[PDB]
């Protein structure tokens, strides 16, 4: 799963 970027839904 993605830690990612809160801005990418």
């Amino acid at each position, epitope marked *: *799963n*993605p*830690n*990612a*970027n*809160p*801005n*990418a*839904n």
Partner: antibody
Amino acid sequence: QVQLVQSGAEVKKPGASVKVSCKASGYTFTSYAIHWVRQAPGQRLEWMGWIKAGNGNTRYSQKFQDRVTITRDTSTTTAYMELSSLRSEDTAVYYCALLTVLTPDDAFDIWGQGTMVTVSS
Amino acid sequence: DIVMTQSPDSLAVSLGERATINCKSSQSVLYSSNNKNYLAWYQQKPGQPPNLLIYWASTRQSGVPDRFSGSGSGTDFTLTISSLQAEDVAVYYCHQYYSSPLTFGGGTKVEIKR
């Protein structure tokens, strides 16, 4: 017009600290996270961290050994990034930006103009 | 971390020709829950901040010309400029926003042959 405006270039001596500002306007400040990315001369973009403007939670890159500190002032709709124990490798252009704000209805991506920091005596 | 690697480091083509940039990720960027590739392409001209071109690996943001397109899945992606224009001189970066820390490619310098 979503817009991000950063403070001006500065010179700092080795071992000192620097704090860069990022004024946000044209949108609901607290609903998005503001990232900080630097670009050393002749080098690739390097992610440092981000802060959710609402709850103020932060996530930092381990590669900076926790000498980065990202904070946020909601009333001034402004985000800050402080980098301490400056070394020669920290000379770079420091950007704040709303990276990849993706929703089914609309998507956008906004950056500040950059802030050049030179570590020199 | 997720290392991003681009090929070539630089390329030169004539005006109106096609230009392509490859980007590989050290591990997969496709998320199985929504089947979307957390990959983006950025354009950066000298003295300016990057400019988003493609997100979700193949979706082009509203203000970008049609000649820009992206393809790929998982660990291998390609940026395509179908008809290079003079104003396309820039360093192009691929970027993964899948795992922390977010990482960018080494950049690909695009030049015009004149």
